[PDB]
């Protein structure tokens, strides 16, 4: 709804054409694409680590 750079993927999604507020483990975008975007207040990986601490479910 409200793109949250602190929490979300940040990467302007070519589907939706808005930042990527899918999730922190955004299925739309590859790892590099999440990392490339400086959306979060921390690195992507470090941020995803927090995601994994919550939603530690990865495919
Ligand atoms: Zn994304």
Ligand 1 center–CA 50 separation, angstroms: 16
Ligand 1 center–CA 57 separation, angstroms: 17
Do 44 and 33 touch, CB atoms closer than 8 A? no
* Whole-number Å distance between alpha carbons of 53 and 18: 26
For residue 4, which of 48, 39, 37, 51 has the smallest C-alpha distance? Answer: 39
- Token duo for residue 48: 């995803």
* Whole-number Å distance between alpha carbons of 59 and 37: 22
The count of other CB atoms within 10 Å of the CB of residue 59 is 4
What range does the domain containing 44 cover?
Answer: 30-56
Ligand 1 center–CA 12 separation, angstroms: 7
Ligand 1 center–CA 16 separation, angstroms: 10
38: domain CATH number? Answer: 6.10.140.670
Map tokens 């921390």 to a residue: 42
Do 4 and 21 touch, CB atoms closer than 8 A? yes
Do 23 and 29 touch, CB atoms closer than 8 A? no
**DSSP assignments along 18-53, one per residue:** S---S-TT-SSS-HHHHHHS--SSS-HHHHHHHHHH
């Amino acid at each position: 709804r409200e793109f949250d750079p602190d929490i979300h993927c940040g990467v302007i999604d070519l589907d939706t054409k808005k930042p990527c507020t899918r999730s922190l483990t955004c299925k739309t975008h590859s790892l590099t694409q999440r990392r490339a975007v400086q959306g979060r207040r921390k690195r992507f990986d470090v941020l995803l680590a927090e995601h994994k601490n919550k939603t530690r479910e990865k495919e």
